Amino acid sequence: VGNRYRLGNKIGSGSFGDIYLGTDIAAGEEVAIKLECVKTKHPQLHIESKIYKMMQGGVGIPTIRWCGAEGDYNVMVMELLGPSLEDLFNFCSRKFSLKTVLLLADQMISRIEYIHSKNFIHRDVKPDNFLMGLGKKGNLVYIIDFGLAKKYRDARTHQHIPYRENKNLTGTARYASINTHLGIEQSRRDDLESLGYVLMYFNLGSLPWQGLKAATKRQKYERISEKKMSTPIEVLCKGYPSEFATYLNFCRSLRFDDKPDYSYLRQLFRNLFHRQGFSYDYVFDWNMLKF
Amino acid sequence: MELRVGNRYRLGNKIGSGSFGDIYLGTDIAAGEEVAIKLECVKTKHPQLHIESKIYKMMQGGVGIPTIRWCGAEGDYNVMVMELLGPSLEDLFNFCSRKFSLKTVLLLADQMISRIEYIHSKNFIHRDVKPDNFLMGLGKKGNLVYIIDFGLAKKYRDARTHQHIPYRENKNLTGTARYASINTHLGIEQSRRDDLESLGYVLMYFNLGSLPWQGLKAATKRQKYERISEKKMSTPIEVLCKGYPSEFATYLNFCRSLRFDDKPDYSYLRQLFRNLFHRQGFSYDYVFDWNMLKF
Ligand SMILES: Cn1ncc(-c2nc(N[C@H]3CC[C@H]([NH3+])CC3)ncc2F)c1CC1CC1
Ligand SMILES: Cn1ncc(-c2nc(N[C@H]3CC[C@H]([NH3+])CC3)ncc2F)c1CC1CC1
Structure with a gap:
């Protein structure tokens, strides 16, 4: 994933997507990864990423490392909290x-x-x-x-x-x-x-x-x-x-x-x-x- | 599951093993910092984790040496909390x-x-x-x-x-x-x-x-x-x-x-x-x- 991400185990569910721990392999940086089935009927994950991007630099707003697709999944990689x-x-x-x-x-x-x-x-x-x-x-x-x-x-x-x-x-x-x-x-x-x-x-x-x-x-x-x-x-x-x-x-x-x-x-x-x-x-x- | 050790540490998923124990990712609830947590299941009167923690203490401050946050006992386990690397x-x-x-x-x-x-x-x-x-x-x-x-x-x-x-x-x-x-x-x-x-x-x-x-x-x-x-x-x-x-x-x-x-x-x-x-x-x-x- 992304020249760098190891998908880990599932930790919960968010709106329209499960969250997994994952790791920035080269960096050793544990991250959170939200998965949307890339073939879903209501793709909303890249929409959500752009809202996060509009909020960038706000106090208490999570940073997005990478948004994309991989295999059969639209993915959003977030800093771990x-x-x-x-x-x-x-x-x-x-x-x-x-x-x-x-x-x-x-x-x-x-x-x-x-x-x-x-x-x-x-x-x-x-x-x-x-x-x-x-x-x-x-x-x-x-x-x-x-x-x-x-x-x-x-x-x-x-x-x-x-x-x-x-x-x-x-x-x-x-x-x-x-x-x-x-x-x-x-x-x-x-x-x-x-x-x-x-x-x-x-x-x-x-x-x-x-x-x-x-x-x-x-x-x-x-x-x-x-x-x-x-x-x-x-x-x-x-x-x-x-x-x-x-x-x-x-x-x-x-x-x-x-x-x-x-x-x-x-x-x-x-x-x-x-x-x-x-x-x-x-x-x-x-x-x-x-x- | 949210598991908790030493009162103030969240114990997350297993990340591997070392000498005499397994290593877990975790978090220090009180200080708000990610840590690594080593767990030793005690089988005898002569366990190893406290001995190991004293070696780390003796090395503290050296370049490229992890700092230890806590070592203690919990049920049949010894627990050592370290700087995440x-x-x-x-x-x-x-x-x-x-x-x-x-x-x-x-x-x-x-x-x-x-x-x-x-x-x-x-x-x-x-x-x-x-x-x-x-x-x-x-x-x-x-x-x-x-x-x-x-x-x-x-x-x-x-x-x-x-x-x-x-x-x-x-x-x-x-x-x-x-x-x-x-x-x-x-x-x-x-x-x-x-x-x-x-x-x-x-x-x-x-x-x-x-x-x-x-x-x-x-x-x-x-x-x-x-x-x-x-x-x-x-x-x-x-x-x-x-x-x-x-x-x-x-x-x-x-x-x-x-x-x-x-x-x-x-x-x-x-x-x-x-x-x-x-x-x-x-x-x-x-x-x-x-x-x-x-x-
Ligand atoms: C719903 N959602 N969306 C993004 C994230 C999400 N979760 C974390 N860490 C979780 C570790 C386990 C703790 N029990 C809760 C926080 N870091 C960043 C995130 F964006 C989460 C919470 C994850 C538990 C699902
Ligand atoms: C054996 N041992 N003892 C202490 C530690 C240990 N591990 C870390 N981080 C690990 C994060 C995941 C990486 N894949 C490997 C390093 N930080 C500090 C440590 F003392 C380790 C390495 C952990 C993989 C077991």
Whole structure:
């Protein structure tokens, strides 16, 4: 592969493609490799590579080493990254400290803002799609996986995509916005509402619309929707700082084509961080693991 | 599976094996750095991994020596966490179709002689010199050859007095038969000369693609070692090195002449290859055969 890549074993699945460890043979550089069957009916892997390329040089954006084809596979070779926030959540006993939640929130809001600044919406915000860096970037949260991403505004005019209804749910359900469940075209607000659920997930260990009964997938999604709509934010966020409710209310009240106030959202959490008297050392819970 | 050792290390996939254990790729969760992790399954009261880790500690700071992050116990395992390095010389040889240019062989020789001299300066002999136990650095240290695996190493002299260990016979055949010195095959206590003779076979292996005592099969380890030994003893150095610069044979003959307790002239051996390198018109620029690959 590429005058240089050894395909290794499979480690998981991303949107529209399995990921494998692999190695830059001459360099000795372990990499991540996403495979799409080159003969697939919906080739999207080179599309995804060009979105990554448009995001190049952004803080917390993964670098693409090589995109191409080999054998019967469109391949994308990515720099290797560390554990997911889900992985780190497990390593930390499925509890993060408030300090770590607020440190993550600041970076995650900014990562979303950056993607939006480059005319895209992510559409799959969840703990599995945020990875810590390696080496000198170990305290940098990366966002990965643009296989569900869409352009929400025209690159020349900045005209926003039009409002659409009766859409089927394309990510998966735990972190989806209310409007996504209701069939509304996703926009910038929905990425941010999903992040709000992710932050409550880290606070609680679970969300109250996990583990619901249904006969079929369609129904399961409908029941998750119903649970989200019928659980007031003040009940969802009971016993946690009011900032988490304020953040979610804000995102839920945004217009479809609104530019979110990302600075207001960061400032909510920063003000909380100041009130709590946490030190400005940028140390996460997992940085204190000792042998 | 996400497996975790020593509280702060993720243990990934197996990448190979070394002396007394398997090696795994991993990650230091707390410091955010990739590492290599060695695991020893303990079968007796006298395990090897902690002993090995102290050898590495004694060598710390040397050029081309990996740093150790942690060594400890977990269930029936000993675990040693190390600085991650790049591909081995055997990996690179395969990647290059089991052909290295002369320039590459001589760049490698210069550094390999130096790594062995450094281990000797710290009062140890390595005892399993082979391509698999030399790794290139990562990134900006990619021009640097590292030496690894001290599981079979031994102290050969006193640190203060330089008193050398005694000559002994009837030793077991430790190491790798392909690259072992003739004295090692004969059961003689290993010393500095034997590390350097092994290096000489490595260099000819790189020149040839294989050594002429590869391929032979036996029922037992002794019979295998013997077939190799006989072929080694019965193949003159000038027949082994036929069609290659005279320096390769001069190197092996020098090593074979050394007395058990002789201090090798490492400088002479380096100069022998450097003089060749320059007479061939090569530029000393750390440009190895694998660095010439285009996109
Ligand atoms: C979905 N996706 N897309 C790209 C990558 C992806 N994954 C990694 N490393 C993984 C190592 C195992 C850890 N448990 C998770 C991170 N590095 C870079 C990537 F782009 C991934 C995560 C891989 C686990 C599938
Ligand atoms: C035997 N041993 N002991 C320590 C190490 C060892 N291996 C590495 N990296 C390996 C990455 C994959 C490459 N294919 C080979 C080198 N870094 C540091 C080490 F100490 C090794 C080499 C690993 C292949 C087993």
